Design a protein around this ligand. Structure first.
Ligand SMILES: Nc1nc2c(ncn2[C@@H]2O[C@H](COP(=O)(O)OP(=O)(O)O)[C@@H](O)[C@H]2O)c(=O)[nH]1
Ligand SMILES: Nc1nc2c(ncn2[C@@H]2O[C@H](COP(=O)(O)OP(=O)(O)O)[C@@H](O)[C@H]2O)c(=O)[nH]1
Ligand SMILES: [Mg+2]
Ligand SMILES: [Mg+2]
Lengths: 171, 171
C-alpha cells in the first residue's frame, strides 16, 4: 500500500523514542538507550487509506543537522519535537528545521511541531509561543504526551496528511 | 539626561546603516562602506523624556554573535533587523537573538524586530510570518524603510520604550 517515510527529530531527552514506541506498540517506555537509532514500521488506516509508516527514530551526536543521511534526504516528512519543560530543546527547533530545509533544497517539506510531555504540570514553554512559531513556520503544532499517550496518534497522522497534501499539490 | 545604549544588529545589506543614518541626519544614504562600524548619537525627546541615544551601527565578520563586545554586554536594547526581500537575513534573526541572550544571561533583553525596505514592492517575507515570530518571541515588529523613512522613528523609539519598561520593572 502506500508507504510514508517519516523522521522524528529533536534534542536528546525530549521523548522521540517514547513517542515512536508509543505509536508502534502502545506502551510507555522509560529508560531507552539514548544512543540507539533505528527504524520502526506499522500498518495503519488513516482517513480510509491503508498505509505503511516507515519511521526513523533519530539518535546520536550530530550537531543539529542530518542524523541518518539516507533517510533525511529521503524522508517525506519530519516530526520536530521538543519537550514543554525544556526551553533549550525548544529553542533548538530552528536548527533542526534548517538542516532539513538544507538537505532537501526547500522551505516546504512536510513537518509538524510537537510539544511533548504535556503531562508534566510545570512548563517552561507555553502553548501560545509554540503555536506562534508554528504559525510563522506554516506548520501544525500539536501537544502530546508519550506517557498518557495524549496526542501521539494525532501528531503522526497529522504529519501523514501534510505529506499527502504536499504530494497532491504537484497534481 | 537619560542615556540609552542601543545596538543595531542583523545581516549585511539589510539597511542597518541606512536606518541609523536616516534617524540621526535625515537623509537616505546608499553605498556606505559595509565594513565601517561606529557609534552615533542624537538628543531626542520621546514621550516627554529628553534623552541621549547612543547607537552602535554594527559591521564586520562576526559569525552571528557579538559584533562589538563592549557595547553588546553593555547595550541596553537591540534592533534586530532584516530585509523584507531577503529571506536569509530573516531566517538569521534567530542566531542574532541567541548570541544577545547569550552574552546577557537572559531571554528578556529589550529588542524590537525590524522588517526593513518595505518600500520595495516585491517581498519574500510576509508581514504575518514576521509578526508571528515576533509574537512568539514576545517583542514588537515594525516595518520601516530607510528610503522613504517610513517607520524609522517608530522603530527606534519603540525600542527606547521597551528599555524604559524593562528598567521600571525592577521597581
Ligand atoms: N513525563 C513524561 N516523560 C516523558 C515523556 N516522553 C518521554 N519521557 C521521558 O523522557 C526521557 C527521554 O525519552 P526518550 O524517548 O528516551 O527521549 P529521546 O532522547 O527524544 O529518545 C525518558 O525519561 C522518557 O521516559 C512524556 O510524554 N512525559
Ligand atoms: N529600497 C531600499 N534600499 C535600502 C533600504 N535600506 C537600505 N537600503 C540599501 O540596502 C543596501 C544596504 O544598506 P546598508 O545600510 O549599507 O546595509 P547594512 O549592511 O545593514 O549597513 C544599500 O544599497 C542601502 O542603500 C530601504 O529601506 N529601502
Ligand atoms: Mg531515543
Ligand atoms: Mg553598514
Amino acid at each position: 500500500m502506500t508507504e510514508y517515510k517519516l523522521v522524528v527529530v529533536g534534542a536528546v531527552g525530549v521523548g522521540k523514542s517514547a513517542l515512536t514506541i508509543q505509536l508502534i506498540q502502545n506502551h510507555f517506555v522509560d529508560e531507552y538507550d539514548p544512543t540507539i537509532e533505528d527504524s520502526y514500521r506499522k500498518q495503519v488506516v488513516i482517513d480510509g487509506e491503508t498505509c505503511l509508516l516507515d519511521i526513523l527514530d533519530t539518535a546520536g551526536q550530530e550537531e543539529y543537522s542530518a542524523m541518518r543521511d539516507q533517510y533525511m534526504r529521503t524522508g517525506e516528512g519530519f516530526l520536530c519535537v521538543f519537550a514543554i519543560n525544556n526551553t533549550k530543546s525548544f529553542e533548538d527547533i530552528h536548527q533542526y528545521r534548517e538542516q532539513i530545509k538544507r538537505v532537501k533544497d526547500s522551505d516546504d517539506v512536510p513537518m509538524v511541531l510537537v510539544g511533548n510531555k504535556c503531562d508534566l504540570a510545570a512548563r517552561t514553554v507555553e502553548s501560545r509561543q509554540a503555536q506562534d512559531l508554528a504559525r510563522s513556520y506554516g506548520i501544525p503544532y500539536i501537544e502530546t504526551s508519550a506517557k498518557t499517550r495524549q496526542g501521539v496518534e494525532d501528531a503522526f497522522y497529522t504529519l501523514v496528511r501534510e505529506i499527502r497534501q504536499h504530494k497532491l499539490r504537484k497534481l
